[model samples]
Target: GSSGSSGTGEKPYKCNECGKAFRAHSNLTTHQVIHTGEKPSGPSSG
Candidate 1:
């Protein structure tokens, strides 16, 4: 079977502040909030 990204690998979205990568844009957006010291919305657990 072909292994695609499937929201688990090969993160293309990168954070300029910490150089962290994310699979989803929304997740990346959430990570950026850390730089601002602001908490991201929604559940705190994954």
Candidate 2:
């Protein structure tokens, strides 16, 4: 679903690969690997 964002131009984490912005820096880092075709680990189930 929706991750989180104000839908405005106030995003600070800008992706250089596709120009996408994320609300959190960790989210931005998570998105940056799209260029490498790598899959991020799923959240812990504990």
Candidate 3:
């Protein structure tokens, strides 16, 4: 179990990129697809 914050109150996951905030790193990584609109290279190993 874990409980804490990265800073005083900043969300552990955040983004000012398009128009939303992610809750997990993996979610944010997937979001890059929508943001970029293309898969340049992928960790998903296409």
Quick one: ranking by lDDT, best first? 1, 3, 2
lDDT of 2: 0.70
Alpha carbon lDDT at 31, candidate 3: 77
Per-residue lDDT tens digits for candidate 1, residues 1-46, read 7876656557778888887777889998777766875355766655
> TM-scores across all candidates?
0.48, 0.46, 0.44
Decoy 1 TM-score against native: 0.48
Higher lDDT: candidate 2 or 3? 3
Summarize candidate 3's per-residue lDDT along 1-46 as a digit string, tens digits. Answer: 9998665534577767877876678988887766784556656655
Ranking the candidates on TM-score from highest down gives: 1, 2, 3
Candidate maximizing TM-score: 1
lDDT of 2 by residue, 1-46 (tens): 6687566655777787786767888887777666664343675544
Question: Which runs in model 1 stand beyond 4 Å of their true positions?
Answer: 1-10, 37-46
Residue pairs with colliding backbones in model 3 are none
Return the lDDT, model 3, position 15: 62
Backbone collision count in every prediction?
Answer: 0, 0, 0
Worst 10 residues of 1 by lDDT: 37-46
